[PDB]
Amino acid sequence: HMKSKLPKPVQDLIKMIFDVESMKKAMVEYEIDLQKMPLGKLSKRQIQAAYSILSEVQQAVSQGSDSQILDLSNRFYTLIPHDFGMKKPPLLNNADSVQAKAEMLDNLLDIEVAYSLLRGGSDDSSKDPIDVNYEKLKTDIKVVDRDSEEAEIIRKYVKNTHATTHNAYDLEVIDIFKIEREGECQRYKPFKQLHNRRLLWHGSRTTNFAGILSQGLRIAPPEAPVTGYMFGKGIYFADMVSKSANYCHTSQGDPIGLILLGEVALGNMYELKHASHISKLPKGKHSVKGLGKTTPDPSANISLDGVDVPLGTGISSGVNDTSLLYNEYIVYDIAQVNLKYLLKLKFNFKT
Numbered sequence: 001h002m003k004s005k006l007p008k009p010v011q012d013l014i015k016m017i018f019d020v021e022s023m024k025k026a027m028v029e030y031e032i033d034l035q036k037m038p039l040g041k042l043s044k045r046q047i048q049a050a051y052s053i054l055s056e057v058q059q060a061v062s063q064g065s066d067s068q069i070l071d072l073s074n075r076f077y078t079l080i081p082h083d084f085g086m087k088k089p090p091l092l093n094n095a096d097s098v099q100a101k102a103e104m105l106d107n108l109l110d111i112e113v114a115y116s117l118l119r120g121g122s123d124d125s126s127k128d129p130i131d132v133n134y135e136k137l138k139t140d141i142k143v144v145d146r147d148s149e150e151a152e153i154i155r156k157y158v159k160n161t162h163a164t165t166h167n168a169y170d171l172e173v174i175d176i177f178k179i180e181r182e183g184e185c186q187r188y189k190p191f192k193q194l195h196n197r198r199l200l201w202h203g204s205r206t207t208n209f210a211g212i213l214s215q216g217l218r219i220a221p222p223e224a225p226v227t228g229y230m231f232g233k234g235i236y237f238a239d240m241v242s243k244s245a246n247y248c249h250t251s252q253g254d255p256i257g258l259i260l261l262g263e264v265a266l267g268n269m270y271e272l273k274h275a276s277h278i279s280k281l282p283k284g285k286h287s288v289k290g291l292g293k294t295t296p297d298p299s300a301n302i303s304l305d306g307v308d309v310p311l312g313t314g315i316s317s318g319v320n321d322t323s324l325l326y327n328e329y330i331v332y333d334i335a336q337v338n339l340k341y342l343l344k345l346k347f348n349f350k351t
């Protein structure tokens, strides 16, 4: 094949996110049986059906027996096969069980998209598959120069917003990509001049990124249990890098992670201290802010392309009885997100 004229950083990114064995490695981390439910048999209607059984388990938990729960728990394992041998699998009887399997199915949606791009489309041996797979993302990815002003601001955002409670690792920036998904700037047009636009982090495991770059950040479907998400079904962002970095699910056994910097149109924020499982905002509000105990210093805010970057050092917020150590931002219309950067990160675990 022609050998591909993309920059080396962009080529390594494509290999990373379209890695088939990584998708399998992620599936088994959720205790899925690849014998019964391999990567190829995975589909949206099975995932949605599973979500719905998870919604029924939510219902039985909210109204209090281990007899009826058993049947609902078993129907879930019927739809998404798990690896337990000749088993008796563990019972899904609490809110934690619901949250955990919801977060798995979230990931399965992104893996299904990644794999479907991989096995859809055309097969040309005279093209480098790196280029082939790059085109399927429908995203322009360019490497940012390490000396540029936007690189300096971004590295400072990474540097200044690592939390003391997440000090089991620290982060090096390897590559900074400027990204532009097809049609997203057009979709963002109604919110482009809205007040309170903020450049915020979103981390995910690397096996979600083909899905994210092709489909954008999305809302979990109607079938998903709204109780499974702290502030309902929306797109979640953080202003502290380490909080988002945790959702990469790096380890000593694979600490290369990817993280997004997106422009989020927050507008009039509906501020909350504790969990609230809503499927729609109250009138006049464009986002939810989960109020952190700590927050980046408001005096140290900086502008990048007319978007506030909250890159100050973490200080006290003056909020008392909150569930959240750090801030959290949720939007409930996918048109309120414009993804601007993607960072490849080097996790230095000190444990």
Ligand SMILES: CCN1CCN(C(=O)c2cc(Cn3c(=O)[nH]c(=O)c4ccccc43)ccc2F)CC1=O
Pocket (backbone or CB within 6 Å): 106, 109, 110, 201, 202, 203, 204, 216, 217, 218, 219, 220, 221, 229, 233, 234, 235, 236, 237, 238, 243, 244, 245, 247, 328, 329
């Ligand atoms: C089905 C696709 N999907 C559902 C998962 N998703 C989210 O934004 C999302 C993400 C999380 C977890 N999470 C997360 O994965 N990354 C974060 O940076 C983050 C920051 C603050 C709070 C939660 C975070 C929890 C619920 C969610 F809905 C976007 C998304 O595209």
